[PDB]
């Protein structure tokens, strides 16, 4: 059991290591309410967050709108931005490589 | 002017550096830089490693 535990954690780390580090996502998110039809129990569980993300050219940035779950973001009291990613105060967030099951 | 948790923001940091750790540099708003930034990468030693 101890060997299986260490083997699964080691293989997990090896799978995630050669992947995107998502350093540009630790920015400030302009999150608003999702404008679609939301059921009674989903109100406030999904936010429409706009940020300025980097692109290939170092000096060019694009405005990106994405839907984040409320559990993935934490409020803050900046004047111009409302939320940040929950893990940006603790660690870098590695994206799992796409086309990996 | 140090970076912080969020790429958007920065922070004004004050610290005491030894003269041997800094080198004179010429700029409009600054006087010194770290001695090794001119030649090599600086890695902070982990505080948990004795």
């Amino acid at each position: 059991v101890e060997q299986m535990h260490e083997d699964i954690i080691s293989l997990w780390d090896q799978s995630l290591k050669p992947c995107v580090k998502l350093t540009p996502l630790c920015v400030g998110l302009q999150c608003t309410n999702v404008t679609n039809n939301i059921t009674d129990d989903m109100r406030g569980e999904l936010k429409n967050c706009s940020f300025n993300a980097t692109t290939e050219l170092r000096n060019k940035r694009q405005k990106v709108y994405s839907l984040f779950y409320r559990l993935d973001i934490v409020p803050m009291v900046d004047l111009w931005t409302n939320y940040r990613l929950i893990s940006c105060n603790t660690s870098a967030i590695t994206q799992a490589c796409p086309k990996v099951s | 002017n140090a970076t912080t948790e969020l790429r958007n923001k920065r922070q004004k940091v004050y610290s005491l550096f030894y003269r041997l750790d800094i080198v004179p540099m010429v700029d409009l708003w600054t006087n010194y830089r770290l001695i090794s930034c001119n030649t090599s990468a600086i890695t902070q030693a982990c505080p948990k490693v004795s």
Partner: antibody, heavy 130, light 113 residues
Framework: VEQLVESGGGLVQPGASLRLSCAAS????????MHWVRQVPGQGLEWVSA???????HYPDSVKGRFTISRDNAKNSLYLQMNSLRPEDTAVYYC??????????????????????????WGRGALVTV | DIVMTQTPLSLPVTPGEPASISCRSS????????????LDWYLQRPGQSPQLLIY???NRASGVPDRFSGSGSDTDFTLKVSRVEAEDVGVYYC?????????FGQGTKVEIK
């Protein structure tokens, strides 16, 4: 000193539009937030709008959809385009400076942790009467 | 939104006695991560109407004399002045600095007693 001068205004009819502006003075319109504030002749101070370093704007519920603010930066002036004015909107309007940042390509326009958020660099104000 | 409530609406003060002007924010103004509480006092005069007076707690704006130094916490905060001078008579305003609405409270008009 660091002090801007408002220019523009006049007497208009309901439904008219206006382009009110504040000029830059002593680099207060470079790396800084900007605010528009209303002084009602007989009531207290009311905030009208604010614009960030990156061109984000914010208005209160009574203003959204009527007033627009912008910055061009190349010509060192702040603009307020007023539309759909009402008699209740007769007041003295003026600019204020917010917090300050900087512009390095690590990430365009950055704020300070614990930086300034007060309204400073107050002008004289333009009178808008409907 | 944040509602800023000014306690006095009128306060005649004799120039030879101290005065206290206070207000309260409906929400806490403390930025826990930064540690700074964002509150501002403004003083309106018949001449130059807008003017910054006090920034946060016990941090005087440039040009403001020591007699205007205030105190308070993250909700209820106050200015206490030992003597009101002729140049100091005007309308005081409270502002919150943590949300973009920047709500202002009612003004306190100082009178000669």
């Amino acid at each position: 000193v660091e002090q801007l001068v408002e220019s523009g205004g006049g007497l208009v009819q309901p439904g008219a539009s206006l382009r009110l502006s504040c000029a830059a003075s002593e680099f207060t319109f470079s790396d800084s937030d900007m605010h528009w504030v209303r002084q009602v002749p007989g009531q207290g101070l009311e905030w009208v709008s604010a614009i960030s370093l990156g061109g984000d704007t914010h208005y209160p519920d009574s203003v959204k959809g009527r007033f627009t603010i912008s910055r061009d930066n190349a010509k060192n002036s702040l603009y307020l385009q007023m539309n759909s004015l009402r008699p209740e909107d007769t007041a003295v309007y003026y600019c204020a400076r917010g917090g300050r940042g900087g512009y390095e390509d690590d990430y365009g326009y950055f704020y300070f942790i614990g930086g300034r958020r007060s309204l400073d660099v107050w002008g004289r104000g333009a009178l808008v009467t409907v | 939104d944040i509602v800023m409530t000014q306690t006095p609406l009128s306060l005649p003060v004799t120039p030879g006695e101290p005065a206290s002007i206070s207000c309260r924010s409906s929400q806490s103004l403390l930025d826990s991560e930064a540690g700074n509480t964002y509150l501002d006092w403004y003083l309106q005069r018949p001449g130059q109407s807008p003017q910054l007076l006090i920034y946060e707690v016990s941090n005087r704006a440039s040009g403001v004399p020591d007699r205007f130094s205030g105190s308070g916490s993250d909700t209820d905060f106050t200015l206490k002045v030992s003597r009101v001078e002729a140049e100091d008579v005007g309308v005081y305003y409270c502002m919150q600095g943590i949300q973009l609405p920047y709500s202002f409270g009612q003004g306190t008009k100082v009178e000669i007693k």
